[PDB]
From a paper:
Here, the crystal structure of [name] bound to its proposed product, coenzyme A, is reported at 1.38 Å resolution, solved using the halide-soak method with multiple anomalous dispersion. We therefore co-crystallized [name] with acetyl-CoA. A second crystal was obtained co-crystallized with substrate acetyl-CoA, and high-resolution complex data were collected. The structure of the CoA complex of [name] and the native structure were refined by PHENIX and CCP4, respectively, to resolutions of 1.38 and 1.56 Å, respectively. Although there is low occupancy of the acetyl group in the structure, the functional groups of acetyl-CoA form an extensive set of interactions with the protein, supporting the premise that this is a bona fide ligand of [name]. Soaks with acetyl-CoA reveal that the CoA head, and likely the acetyl group, are held between cysteine and histidine side chains from opposite sides of the cradle in a conformation suggestive for reaction. The two structures of [name] presented here, obtained under different conditions, suggest that [name] allows some flexibility in the CoA head group.
The principal CPS of the human pathogen and Tier 1 select agent [name] consists of a linear repeat of –­3)-­2-O-acetyl-6-deoxy-β-d-manno-heptopyranose-(1–. This CPS is critical to the virulence of this emerging pathogen and represents a key target for the development of novel therapeutics. [name] is one of several genes in the CPS biosynthetic cluster whose deletion leads to significant attenuation of the pathogen; unlike most others, it has no homologues of known function and no detectable sequence similarity to any protein with an extant structure.
Residue numbers in the entry: 1 to 311
Write the structure that this text describes.
Amino acid sequence: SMAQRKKYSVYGSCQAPALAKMLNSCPTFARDWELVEMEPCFVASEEQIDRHLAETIPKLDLFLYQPVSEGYRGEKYSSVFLRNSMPPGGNALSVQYMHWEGYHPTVNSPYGLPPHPEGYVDALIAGAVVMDVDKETYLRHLEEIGASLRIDIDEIESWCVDELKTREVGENDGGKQIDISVTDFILANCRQKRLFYTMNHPTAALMREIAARCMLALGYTYSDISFDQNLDPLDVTKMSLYPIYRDCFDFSELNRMNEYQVLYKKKAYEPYLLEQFEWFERSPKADVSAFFDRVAANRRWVRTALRRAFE
Ligand SMILES: *SCCNC(=O)CCNC(=O)[C@H](O)C(C)(C)COP(=O)(O)OP(=O)(O)OC[C@H]1O[C@@H](n2cnc3c(N)ncnc32)[C@H](O)[C@@H]1OP(=O)(O)O
Ligand SMILES: [Cl-]
Ligand SMILES: [Cl-]
Ligand SMILES: [Cl-]
Ligand SMILES: [Cl-]
């Protein structure tokens, strides 16, 4: 019934609690399923993950999860190890980890550098710092950078799709193919609808879409699927598209590059980008260079933009 709904959990990145929130907002889903919450992979403590292996997972009818490698934090947090503890007759369905750099091709997260309080940094700025390009020069060249990215938009999108398709194979989930994905949807809609606020924070529209695919995988009909349209669980931070590049997107509005939102606060694009320079200049140059090299290695358009703007 209702006090006798089946039990499910959602484990994975920050997208996992967001997906549970979205699913719970569908009355037909909520009629059948009761959430038992699991902390996501980046925050679960050892005590918490131990408890979930012992007490949560063996009681689930459904484990919706994103692939998480053993190398991330250890076996205990890995999707292979967690799903192994499911009871007989339980169902474990993998859900795509949604990552897409196509709106903000200059943005990534620190590797080998201190964590940034906002979680994201502009990697092209890191390259400029290494190249001894001054912050004022960079700010005067935003259009040249955006023009380069615009010329390269198809290459960028092709790579973004390939990264998702490669991950569908599930190497970080013991070689199990990902059950539930939205790759074709993302490519087909990305220029028409804003699908990501940051590379790994889907907007409401994308969260609804993936939640819908989960419901289809569970055997619900298309007509069963409806969500709270006001839910936008990953809206904390909103990266701004660069000038010129932004005009490739149907939704693009204000001010020659929009303000950023970071941790729910608005920040004008000029001070935001100047502060990125200041942040990188605090770290050892060798480490900033290692970071930029790591980002640029498989992202041709990044070095191309730096060269076209600053050579
Ligand atoms: S909801 C956003 C919360 N943020 C995070 O969890 C931090 C960023 N994500 C990750 O570190 C990983 O994606 C997690 C969730 C821990 C899973 O890690 P795995 O070891 O299982 O494997 P991944 O392939 O998911 O991650 C490895 C690196 O690859 C980046 N990444 C994932 N997906 C893509 C796509 N499609 N394109 C490019 N890069 C992608 C991850 O961010 C991660 O980056 P590193 O810089 O190597 O940490
Ligand atoms: Cl059971
Ligand atoms: Cl799809
Ligand atoms: Cl924008
Ligand atoms: Cl060229």
